[PDB]
Design a protein around this motif. Structure first.
Motif, mmCIF file in Angstrom:
data_model
loop_
_atom_site.group_PDB
_atom_site.id
_atom_site.type_symbol
_atom_site.label_atom_id
_atom_site.label_comp_id
_atom_site.label_asym_id
_atom_site.label_seq_id
_atom_site.Cartn_x
_atom_site.Cartn_y
_atom_site.Cartn_z
ATOM 1 N N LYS A 293 1.135 2.920 -3.619
ATOM 2 C CA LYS A 293 0.472 4.215 -3.662
ATOM 3 C C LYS A 293 1.458 5.368 -3.573
ATOM 4 O O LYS A 293 1.191 6.436 -4.118
ATOM 5 C CB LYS A 293 -0.568 4.315 -2.549
ATOM 6 N N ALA B 130 16.628 3.961 -8.347
ATOM 7 C CA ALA B 130 16.411 4.850 -7.213
ATOM 8 C C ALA B 130 15.083 4.560 -6.533
ATOM 9 O O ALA B 130 14.901 4.882 -5.353
ATOM 10 C CB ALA B 130 16.471 6.302 -7.673
ATOM 11 N N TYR C 210 5.551 11.660 -13.984
ATOM 12 C CA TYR C 210 6.324 10.714 -14.772
ATOM 13 C C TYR C 210 6.885 9.642 -13.851
ATOM 14 O O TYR C 210 6.765 9.715 -12.627
ATOM 15 C CB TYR C 210 7.430 11.414 -15.572
ATOM 16 N N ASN D 34 16.060 1.899 -4.323
ATOM 17 C CA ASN D 34 16.785 2.561 -3.253
ATOM 18 C C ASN D 34 15.829 3.199 -2.258
ATOM 19 O O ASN D 34 16.125 3.262 -1.061
ATOM 20 C CB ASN D 34 17.706 3.616 -3.851
ATOM 21 N N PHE D 35 14.681 3.670 -2.737
ATOM 22 C CA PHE D 35 13.685 4.224 -1.834
ATOM 23 C C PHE D 35 13.020 3.132 -1.012
ATOM 24 O O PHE D 35 12.746 3.323 0.179
ATOM 25 C CB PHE D 35 12.652 5.003 -2.634
ATOM 26 N N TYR E 53 9.484 -4.971 9.880
ATOM 27 C CA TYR E 53 8.767 -5.823 8.945
ATOM 28 C C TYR E 53 9.680 -6.967 8.545
ATOM 29 O O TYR E 53 10.902 -6.806 8.501
ATOM 30 C CB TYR E 53 8.318 -5.066 7.693
ATOM 31 N N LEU F 33 9.463 6.944 -12.009
ATOM 32 C CA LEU F 33 10.774 6.844 -11.386
ATOM 33 C C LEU F 33 11.703 5.932 -12.178
ATOM 34 O O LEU F 33 11.282 5.140 -13.026
ATOM 35 C CB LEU F 33 10.665 6.290 -9.965
ATOM 36 N N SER F 34 12.988 6.047 -11.874
ATOM 37 C CA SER F 34 13.916 5.011 -12.252
ATOM 38 C C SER F 34 13.738 3.830 -11.308
ATOM 39 O O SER F 34 13.487 4.011 -10.113
ATOM 40 C CB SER F 34 15.353 5.514 -12.192
ATOM 41 N N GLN G 54 2.677 5.843 -6.961
ATOM 42 C CA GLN G 54 1.615 6.524 -7.695
ATOM 43 C C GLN G 54 1.507 7.990 -7.296
ATOM 44 O O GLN G 54 1.050 8.819 -8.092
ATOM 45 C CB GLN G 54 0.285 5.810 -7.473
ATOM 46 N N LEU G 55 1.940 8.327 -6.083
ATOM 47 C CA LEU G 55 1.984 9.720 -5.667
ATOM 48 C C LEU G 55 3.103 10.462 -6.377
ATOM 49 O O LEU G 55 2.955 11.644 -6.715
ATOM 50 C CB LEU G 55 2.152 9.802 -4.152
ATOM 51 N N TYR G 56 4.232 9.788 -6.610
ATOM 52 C CA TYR G 56 5.257 10.365 -7.473
ATOM 53 C C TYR G 56 4.734 10.540 -8.889
ATOM 54 O O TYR G 56 5.027 11.544 -9.550
ATOM 55 C CB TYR G 56 6.501 9.479 -7.500
ATOM 56 N N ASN H 247 4.831 14.412 -9.835
ATOM 57 C CA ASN H 247 5.778 14.831 -10.855
ATOM 58 C C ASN H 247 5.284 14.479 -12.247
ATOM 59 O O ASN H 247 5.719 15.080 -13.234
ATOM 60 C CB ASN H 247 7.140 14.204 -10.573
ATOM 61 N N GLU I 42 0.830 -1.195 0.000
ATOM 62 C CA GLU I 42 0.000 0.000 0.000
ATOM 63 C C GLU I 42 0.865 1.246 0.000
ATOM 64 O O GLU I 42 0.714 2.129 -0.851
ATOM 65 C CB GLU I 42 -0.910 -0.003 1.226
#
Lengths: 201, 239, 238, 248, 230, 199, 215, 228, 213
Positions: F62, F79, F73, F82-83, F98, F75-76, F65-67, F71, F58
């Motif tokens: 999501k 990265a 477009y 990496n997030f 978790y 993401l790579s 989807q917020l990015y 923005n 989630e």
């Protein structure tokens, strides 16, 4: 403890026992584990008494708040969804709740299954409890989508008869509701001894 | 009693700062928006390019969810705060409930937060008025407007900025039931409203459509030039 | 006038007149008379109407089984100190498991209203509490003020034109301590009838009576046990 | 009894601290970012050019902010230093977040929100600073943006500074070049801009500053260029003045 | 819970109370500081109001590190507070990096804190200009801050009273290249330029920032060199 | 525990999960899905603590989807991974950690496809192929025998058929039904459920 | 308190006609060592009630301090009202229950004797907050030892005198001195009446040892 | 001057709560009538535009299944009290298995009727009419922004409430019946209003013991309009 | 170390009669191998249609009882009316759930009449679930009493036995017989019996003694 629920062509079948013991001692035989959520929603008590009672009352609360704010009947996926959001907050903190969530959707029948371990899924057939695998035996034997109303009545009634028959933890009354398109309908509540004089021969 | 603090009332009970917040809204740029039966459609006027900058950054129409379409009034950067705030909010509603996020809920969020934001102390209220187009519940076309007081409100057509009662009176003089469900006549209705813009410059018009299942489709100023061509041609038919 | 604005600001005579403004708000309330015998404490209020269809708003409310009060002035602060009042009732009623002595409680009310009569950012409360309580030594009638100087008495009266009833208290305060509960009550309405403009009479629906005793729980009545109290009356000597 | 406005509209409905802040912006030095595709440049104007200084700073208006991005500035100096340290903190936090440089736009709007929160609430003195933005990305290449105290910003190709630069912007529209990415022609054009608008006689290099930002193979290097090439830009541009007076 | 600082923009755009703090620094005590080829010489004008006064109590040339000295033009009691802040900050740099903090980093951090005081509420800004110097990594440096948080880097400058007059005099007599004792020479020259006539070992107080380290000078050697320094 | 696979090709990523949601005695659900469409070129697979898997999906799904809406477009995948691992590292030293086991499958316009493989201990990895469970042991041995860097997607399909057939040979559980995607220059394309008649 | 260091022993308390008599010893044994053979285990509350206690003597000092402070508070009110011994039992019950409810007990075993309004009162207070009323209380081992003697005499006869109950307590304390290892031949007898609260001195027992000459 | 929330008038109270009760009068009117057969209610919508959709404007909202509402003044503040009041009744059912009595609902809202606080926000300007049927049969209630709540037999609010309450006192008695109060109520409505009485101007709210549900009349409202 | 819970004993019986509700409980208080008192009645007439029985941990019994009475004052002095019995069961259920992770070591039965004046017995568990029943025996003698209650009240496992409604005094004979028979075998039970009868006109009390060992 043994409950089951399965949707088919004409709505959903809801079946349960009514036996709740206390260890090796019978507490009661008349425990309505099918907690009636709405005229359009029903839930189960599957593990935990104040968990299903409280948290399903809080969920019926929240769906009522939803329908007051949006003037709109909620979906069963939303109810099971936010139910899982509420249960997830106490993960690992010693709470048993493995309930079934039943109702009607604009997309049709609404059948969801939520556990305390975040095991929220949908599906077609479910059975919870100690003698649940009994009801997977007889229910998964006699299951078809195109069964009729009294056909599914004697199917699930037979299923609780077998599951309560071999289970020492399942018995009492045979609770039986029937989710329709408009809303559920109480079918009957039958004794296992009556189904033994009836079904033994 | 004075036209200062958002807390006190007039001797006849008024909020002059809410009224002053409506002023920069009324002095804002003009934008129109209608719903088709399937193809909802809108467009801002007064692009006003100044020869030396890029205009993809000044785009005043976006989306929170793919089912919904954004517009505003007043100034820009407060509306940017409300837009990114409601991206967090619509995305959060998306995260909580797996529904498509509804226009009524998100406008209760925006009008409510604008309301209690106006209630809170030492906080300059949002001088904007948003225009929110969503066709979600089986694609049922809906368009809402907001208020600097923070009252979400549904219309059937809408026009804001300067001369909003004038272009709104044109839509009162243009409100045919057949303009919808003949979505090309909804296209001629949008070309009729952009034709009835306060300048009607032809190049300063920016329109965006959606067929309630598609994405936000940005038009071109040559198809719209053909819409002014059929507009002047239909005026020649009236002649 | 520029000093007469706030609570903190002393006047050039030292008399912070906003307190006097709160006193003027207390004088805007209806008339009510509290009294007690040696054993039985009775307090009576004057109900007024908003319109003909509108119900008459009471001022007497029950608090504890041995505590009854009236009120004049503000209403939200009255319910505020009613909830704080019953709150402090159930505090020692829970913990100490005893009913409250009255003077310690009303002293806690004066200390409760000390800070809103003290600090900036805080207004005083328009308060008209006539207080009937029962400790071990029986009935006690107190009265309050927005200056938080609560006064013990044998009987008091506050509201509009209550000074005539105060003179009745002076000319029958010897009578009040000895006579019983029914004729003491009709002494009470023989103070409220002097809180009346004489062109109208004390009717049924515009009055209510709270009675508390050393063996009697505090109970309020309206027209029903009041109609047997509204009998045994004389007209005004016109 | 001691409250300024700091969060309130003027009577009719306009704004007060924003307009006076822009009036503080107009009384400053001049910078520019020019049209270039193979990189981008910045001209700048030295203020307080007294001789007994040290000038060992090498960057006064320029702030190379992360790797391939810099900003000229106009306004309160140490307030702007707060905003640059905060800015490098934000985009450096983005580089911590993704280990990827910023797309620069959400950085620009982010700082516009930083000043903007001071415009709405917490009635203090806001930042009376407008400042430039140069950079490069994988989505639009070399970029140019303009900060505003109103929370607004500009995606430009020919920017604007205050009172000294309105005639410069009219020179950018009347002398607007398009299509050529030639940095040196942009240096002669900017030498014309600072030549007319900068009232320094014969365009002394100690009153001006120039630094560029070009693409190098993945590095996108930043040429904080020295003074001798500025000197031959002076002699070259005065040679262009000789070419201008050939018609006499 | 007050404070929207104090500060609004003027209709011109100026900051009036900050300008009044600059008037307070302009009414401040005169001093001068000269970056020589080897170090920086700080010299203050410190005359006691009464003849009863002890000069061993108050001291003007103040180190922050053993290579860093600092003087001011403003008030002593605020000067002790901001000096104490710079002491704590410099110790924090020494805790993080275990290394003596460079004077540029002093001016960035401390000047940023003073800018916070300009955009800081509750009271007034600190009407004290500062002369900061240190012989950091070969080169000495000379950095001048203001009450408004900004700063500069001077070869030689003066603040206090007649600072434009001694600024023109250091502009005349001073050059690029001197030595330490030459900077003391023209520093006593610019000190007697604007100072009173009776100038003794206690009327002034001088420190230097050698590359070997900061050296707060004493009235002994001030009485020795300043025994008719020209 | 059960299975994943993330086979990297020259221009494609072939991934396969199961459809099993058994609970300790029986198979509760035989049509489960774990394939999580993060974007039009980026996919998520996970096996871990079933509460943490969903809630993590989630927040990350999501949030991507917020990015995408913010923005506007994509993401790579690098990265983005990496997030995600960043959020695992945030989640690790916490009162609520978790226990999920991730692997990611993205595609670039520049770098082409990409394979990332995480841990329950927040480990970044860039692999040709990765898996989970003890089918990780068996299938990485078999694919280790049959790896080719420049291999066609049909050899990946039939090689996956073979390796699954050896998975039917000496594995203790049932695992009948396996979902499969494929990534290309276009994006996500579903291949059919993969089940096998045993006898 | 997880580990009580210095503890008391059994405390005897019983009503009589017109008052309550409560006796206890003067022994502060730290473990098997009688480290403090001269203490006082009874707090005399002003005129109506009186506290005997067992368990931690430092806790007895503490509750002595707090309760004495509260008595000083309502006395210095001067309203003509005091605490009832039942209210002392109430607040002490709430205090011990809230005490143990934070899983930090106070190792005590308390007995409240209050003769007031012509009414004798004898309330028990547990460390665990279990608290009740009884005509005769016997803490510690004396629940196992002298409490059947107490109930024996009470079932033998409901009412008693101060001399009967007093010498009864003397015999029971003597018995506790015979077979209690935490006993000591020095005790105090106290008595609340309408004449007030009375504390007696370091009284002692009178043993028998004639059976030692037997084998 | 214009002493707000923290200064009384030299005679009485707040010059700001006086401004709120002052700020009631600008709103449209509404008339509820407690009939023993069941509390009816009506309101003027005051619809301006042809584009102005009539059902978009709400005045009667359904707190509980036998509880309607009616507002006067500040819209979303009133609706905030609606949603929160529904929460409070849901707490009473949640912890009591039963509906909160409508007077105690009004006391629950009437607690924070005056709990405005800018320290330790602003006061509200909306007056409320409450229709319910509790265990004591039908109930009709009126509170104010000043929290001085009173039960009312039949109450008019908003604009022209002087002549509306006056003519109401003319037409009212104790033994009124339901449709009598309905047609008499809309008589008073088309008296006090300025627009032509059609289906768009008004809406009804009818609670009964046998009709606890459905505080509304749907397009037989139009029939009762043509019944007069 | 400190154990928070202890078993104080108790034996509660409640019968939802036709227009009454009989709640009787022993008054003997014991712990371990020590009687603390022989007079500790667990029956509490809260309202005239409600008597509660609370066994288990004694401090939680007294504590929780005082909390119940306080919230009765909250409901009525908030609301000018008394609670219904099921509202007390609901609010109590929210209390016992509100101390979920530190439960009360306490069993609970609420007796009393409904709004129809018929008996309403609500059993409880130490976490807070409940239902309306006809008869419950809580405490130590639950297995001692419930099957005979099935034999007499429920008439279970009885062939050719019609269902006559049990009268009041016949139920009194039932109560005295089951407390004698349970008293002969429970160590936690004896010395007295607190009997409460919730009628439509008041509550009747009667203490009947038992054996004294």
């Amino acid at each position: 403890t043994t409950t089951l629920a399965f949707k088919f062509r004409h709505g959903v079948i809801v079946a349960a026992d009514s036996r709740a013991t206390a260890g090796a001692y019978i507490a009661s035989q008349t425990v309505k584990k099918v907690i009636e959520i709405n005229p359009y929603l029903l839930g189960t008590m599957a593990g935990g008494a104040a968990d299903c009672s409280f948290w399903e009352r809080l969920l019926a609360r929240q769906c009522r708040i939803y329908e007051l704010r949006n003037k709109e009947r909620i979906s069963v996926a939303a109810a099971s969804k936010l139910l899982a959001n509420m249960v997830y907050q106490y993960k690992g903190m010693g709470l048993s709740m493995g309930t079934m969530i039943c109702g009607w959707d604009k997309r049709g029948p609404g059948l969801y299954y939520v556990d305390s371990e975040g095991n929220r899924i949908s599906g077609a057939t479910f059975s919870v409890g100690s003698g649940s695998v009994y009801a997977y035996g007889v229910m998964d034997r006699g299951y078809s989508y195109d069964l009729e109303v009294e056909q599914a009545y004697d199917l699930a009634r037979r299923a609780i008869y077998q599951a309560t028959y071999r289970d020492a933890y399942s018995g009492g009354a045979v609770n039986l509701y029937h989710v329709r398109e408009d809303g559920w309908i109480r079918v009957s509540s039958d004794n296992v001894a009556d189904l033994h004089e009836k079904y033994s021969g | 009693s004075y036209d200062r603090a958002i807390t006190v009332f007039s001797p006849d009970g008024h909020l002059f700062q809410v009224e002053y917040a409506q002023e920069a809204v009324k002095k804002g740029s003009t934008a129109v928006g209608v719903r088709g039966r399937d193809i909802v459609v809108l467009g801002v006027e007064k692009k006003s390019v100044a020869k030396l900058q890029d205009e993809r950054t000044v785009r005043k129409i976006c989306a929170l969810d793919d089912n919904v379409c954004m517009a505003f009034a007043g100034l820009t950067a407060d509306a940017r705060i409300v837009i990114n705030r409601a991206r967090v909010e619509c995305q959060s509603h998306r995260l909580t409930v797996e529904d498509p996020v509804t226009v009524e809920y998100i406008t209760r969020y925006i009008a409510s937060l604008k309301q209690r934001y106006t209630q809170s102390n030492g906080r300059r209220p949002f001088g904007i008025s948003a225009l929110i187009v969503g066709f979600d519940f089986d694609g049922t076309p809906r368009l809402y407007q907001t208020d600097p007081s923070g009252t979400y409100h549904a219309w059937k057509a809408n026009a804001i900025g300067r001369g909003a009662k004038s272009v709104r009176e044109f839509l009162e003089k243009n409100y045919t039931d057949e303009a919808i469900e003949t979505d090309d006549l909804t296209i001629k209705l949008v070309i009729k409203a952009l034709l009835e813009v306060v300048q009607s410059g032809g190049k300063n018009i920016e329109l965006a459509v959606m067929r309630r299942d598609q994405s936000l489709k940005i038009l071109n100023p040559e198809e719209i030039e053909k819409y002014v061509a059929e507009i002047e041609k239909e005026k020649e038919e009236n002649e | 006038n520029q000093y007469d604005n706030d609570v903190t600001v002393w006047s050039p005579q030292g008399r912070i007149h906003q307190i006097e403004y709160a006193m003027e708000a207390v004088k805007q309330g209806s008339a009510t008379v509290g009294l007690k015998s040696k054993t039985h404490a009775v307090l009576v209020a004057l109900k007024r109407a908003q319109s003909e269809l509108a119900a008459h708003q009471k001022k007497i409310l029950h608090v504890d089984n041995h505590i009854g009060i009236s009120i004049a002035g503000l209403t939200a602060d009255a319910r505020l100190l009613c909830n704080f009042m019953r709150q402090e009732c159930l505090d020692s009623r829970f913990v100490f498991d005893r009913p409250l002595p009255v003077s310690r409680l009303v002293s806690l009310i004066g200390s409760k209203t000390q800070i809103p009569t003290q600090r900036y950012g805080r207004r005083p409360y328009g308060v008209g509490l006539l207080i009937a309580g029962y400790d071990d030594m029986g009935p006690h009638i107190f009265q309050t003020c927005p200056s938080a100087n609560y006064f013990d008495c044998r009987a008091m009266s506050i509201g509009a034109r209550s000074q005539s009833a105060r003179t009745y208290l002076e000319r029958h305060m010897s009578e009040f301590m000895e006579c019983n509960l029914n004729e003491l009550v009709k002494h009470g309405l023989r103070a409220l009838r002097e809180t009346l403009p004489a062109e109208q009479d004390l009717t049924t629906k515009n009055v209510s009576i709270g009675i508390v005793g050393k063996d009697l729980e505090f109970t309020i009545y309206d027209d029903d046990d009041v109609s047997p109290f509204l009998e045994g009356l004389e007209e005004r000597p016109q | 009894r001691y409250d300024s406005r700091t969060t309130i509209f003027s009577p009719e409905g306009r704004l007060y601290q924003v307009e006076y802040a822009m009036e503080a912006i107009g009384h400053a030095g001049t910078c520019l970012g020019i049209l270039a595709n193979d990189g981008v440049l910045l001209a700048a104007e030295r203020r307080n050019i007294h001789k007994l200084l040290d000038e060992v700073f090498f960057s006064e208006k320029i702030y190379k902010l992360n790797e391939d991005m810099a900003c000229s500035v106009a306004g309160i100096t140490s307030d702007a230093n707060v905003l640059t340290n905060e800015l490098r903190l934000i985009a450096q936090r983005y580089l911590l977040q993704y280990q990827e440089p910023i797309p620069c736009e959400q950085l620009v709007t982010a700082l516009c929100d930083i000043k903007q929160a001071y415009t709405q609430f917490g009635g203090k003195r806001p930042f009376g600073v407008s400042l430039l933005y140069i950079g490069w990305d994988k989505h639009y290449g070399f970029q140019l943006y303009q900060s505003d105290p109103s929370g607004n910003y500009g995606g430009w190709k020919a920017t604007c500074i205050g009172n000294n630069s309105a005639a410069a912007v009219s020179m950018l529209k009347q002398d607007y070049k398009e299509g050529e990415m030639t940095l040196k022609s942009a240096l002669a054009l900017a030498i014309k801009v600072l030549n007319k608008t900068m009232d320094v006689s014969k365009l002394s290099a100690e009153k001006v500053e120039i630094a560029t930002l070009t693409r190098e193979n993945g590095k996108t290097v930043i040429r904080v260029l020295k003074q001798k090439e500025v000197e031959q830009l002076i002699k070259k541009h005065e040679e262009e003045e000789a070419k201008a007076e050939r018609e006499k | 819970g007050y404070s929207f600082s104090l500060t609004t923009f003027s209709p011109s755009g100026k900051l009036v109370q900050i300008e009044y703090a600059l008037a307070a620094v302009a009414g401040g005590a005169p001093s001068v500081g000269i970056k020589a080829a080897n170090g920086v010489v700080l010299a203050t004008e410190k005359k006691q109001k009464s003849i009863l006064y002890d000069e061993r109590s108050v001291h003007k040339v103040e180190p922050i590190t053993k290579h860093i000295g600092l003087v001011y033009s403003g008030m002593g009691p605020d000067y002790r507070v901001l000096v104490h802040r710079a002491r704590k900050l410099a110790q924090q740099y020494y805790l993080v990096y275990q290394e003596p903090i460079p004077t540029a980093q002093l001016v960035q951090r401390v000047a940023s804190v003073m800018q916070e005081y300009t955009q800081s509420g509750g009271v007034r800004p600190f009407g004290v200009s500062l002369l900061i110097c240190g012989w950091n990594e070969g080169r000495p440096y000379l950095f001048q801050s203001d009450p408004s948080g900004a700063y500069f880097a001077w070869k030689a400058t003066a603040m206090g009273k007649n600072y434009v007059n001694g600024k023109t005099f250091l502009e005349k007599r001073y050059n690029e290249d001197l030595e330490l004792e030459d900077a003391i020479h023209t520093a006593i020259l610019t000190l007697k330029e604007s100072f009173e006539g009776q100038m003794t070992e206690d009327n002034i107080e001088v420190g230097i920032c050698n590359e070997a380290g900061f050296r707060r000078l004493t009235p002994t050697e001030v009485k020795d060199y300043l025994a008719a320094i020209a | 525990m059960e299975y994943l696979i993330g086979i990297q090709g020259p221009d494609y990523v072939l991934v396969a999960s199961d459809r099993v949601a058994a609970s300790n005695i029986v198979q509760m659900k035989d049509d489960h899905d774990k394939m999580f469409k993060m974007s039009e070129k980026i996919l998520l697979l996970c096996v871990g603590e079933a509460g943490d898997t969903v809630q993590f999906a989630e927040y990350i799904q999501k949030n991507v989807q917020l990015y995408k809406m913010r923005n506007g477009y994509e993401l790579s995948p690098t990265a983005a991974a990496n997030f995600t691992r960043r959020n695992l590292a945030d989640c690790l030293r916490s009162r609520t950690p978790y226990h999920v086991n991730l692997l990611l499958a993205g595609y670039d316009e520049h770098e082409g496809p990409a394979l990332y493989y995480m841990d329950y201990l927040a480990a970044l990895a860039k692999a040709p192929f990765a898996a989970h469970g003890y089918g990780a042991f068996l299938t990485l041995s078999i694919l280790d025998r049959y790896y080719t860097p420049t291999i066609s997607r049909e050899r990946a399909v039939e090689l996956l058929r073979k390796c699954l057939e050896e998975l039917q040979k000496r594995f203790i559980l049932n695992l009948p039904t396996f979902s499969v995607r494929i990534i290309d220059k276009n994006g996500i394309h579903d291949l059919d459920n993969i089940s096998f008649p045993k006898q | 308190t997880q580990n009580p260091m210095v503890t008391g022993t059994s405390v005897l308390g019983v009503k009589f006609e017109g008052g309550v008599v409560i006796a206890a010893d003067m022994l502060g044994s730290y473990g098997s060592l009688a480290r403090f053979r001269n203490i006082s285990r009874i707090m005399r509350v002003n005129n109506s009630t009186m506290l005997g206690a067992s368990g931690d003597y430092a806790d007895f000092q503490y509750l002595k301090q707090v309760l004495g402070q509260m008595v000083i508070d309502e006395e210095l009110l001067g309203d003509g009202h005091s605490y009832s011994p039942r209210a002392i039992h109430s607040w002490l019950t709430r205090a011990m229950y809230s005490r143990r409810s934070k899983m930090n007990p106070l190792w005590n075993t308390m007995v409240i004797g209050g003769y007031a309004d012509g009414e004798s009162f004898l309330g028990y207070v547990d460390m665990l907050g279990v608290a009740y009323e009884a005509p005769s209380l016997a803490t510690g081992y004396g629940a196992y030892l002298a409490q059947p003697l107490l109930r024996e005499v009470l079932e033998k006869q409901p009412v008693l005198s101060q001399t009967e109950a007093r010498d009864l307590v003397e015999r029971c304390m003597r018995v506790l001195y015979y077979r209690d290892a935490r006993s000591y031949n020095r005790f105090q007898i106290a008595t609340v009446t309408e004449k007030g609260v009375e504390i007696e001195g370091p009284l002692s027992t009178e043993t028998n040892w004639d059976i030692a000459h037997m084998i | 001057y214009d002493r707000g929330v923290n200064t009384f008038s030299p005679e009485g109270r707040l010059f700001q709560v006086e401004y709120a009760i002052e700020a009631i009068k600008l709103g449209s009117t509404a008339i509820g009538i407690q009939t023993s057969e069941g509390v009816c209610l009506a309101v003027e919508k005051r619809i301006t535009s042809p584009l102005m959709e009539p059902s978009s404007i709400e005045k009667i909202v359904e707190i509980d299944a036998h509880i309607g509402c009616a507002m006067s003044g500040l819209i979303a503040d009133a609706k905030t009290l609606i949603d929160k009041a529904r929460v409070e009744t849901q707490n009473h059912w949640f912890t009591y298995n039963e509906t909160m009595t409508v007077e105690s609902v009004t006391q629950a809202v009437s607690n924070l009727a005056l709990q405005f606080g800018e320290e330790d926000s602003r006061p509200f300007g909306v007056a409320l009419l409450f229709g319910g049927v509790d265990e004591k049969g039908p109930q009709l209630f009126h509170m104010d922004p000043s929290g001085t709540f009173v039960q009312c037999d039949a109450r008019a609010i908003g604009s022209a409430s002087e002549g509306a309450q006056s003519s109401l006192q003319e037409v009212y008695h104790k033994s009124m019946t339901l449709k009598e109060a309905i047609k008499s109520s809309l008589i008073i409505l088309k008296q006090v209003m300025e627009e032509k009485l059609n289906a768009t101007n008004i809406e009804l709210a009818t609670v009964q013991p046998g009709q606890n549900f459905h505080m509304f009349t749907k397009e037989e409202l139009e029939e009762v309009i043509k019944d007069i | 170390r400190f154990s928070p819970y202890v078993f104080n004993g108790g034996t509660i019986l409640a019968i939802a009669g036709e227009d009454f509700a009989i709640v009787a409980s022993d008054t003997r208080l014991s712990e371990g191998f020590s009687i603390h008192t022989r007079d500790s009645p667990k029956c509490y007439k809260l309202t005239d249609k409600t008597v509660i029985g609370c066994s288990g941990f004694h401090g939680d019994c007294l504590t929780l009882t005082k909390i119940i009475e306080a919230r009765l004052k909250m409901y009525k002095h908030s609301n000018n009316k008394a609670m219904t019995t099921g509202a007390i069961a609901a609010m109590l259920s929210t209390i016992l759930y509100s101390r979920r992770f530190f439960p009360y070591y306490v069993y609970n039965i609420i007796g009393g009449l409904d709004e129809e004046g018929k008996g309403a017995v609500y059993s409880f568990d130490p976490v807070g679930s409940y239902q309306r029943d006809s008869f419950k025996a809580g405490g130590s003698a639950s297995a001692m009493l419930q099957p005979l209650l099935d034999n007499q009240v429920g008439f279970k496992n009885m062939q050719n036995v019609e269902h006559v409604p049990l009268s009041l005094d016949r139920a009194m004979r039932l109560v005295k017989d089951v407390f004698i028979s349970a008293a002969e075998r429970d160590v936690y039970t004896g010395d007295a019996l607190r009997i409460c009868i919730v009628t439509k006109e008041g509550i009747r009390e009667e203490t009947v003694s038992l054996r004294k060992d």
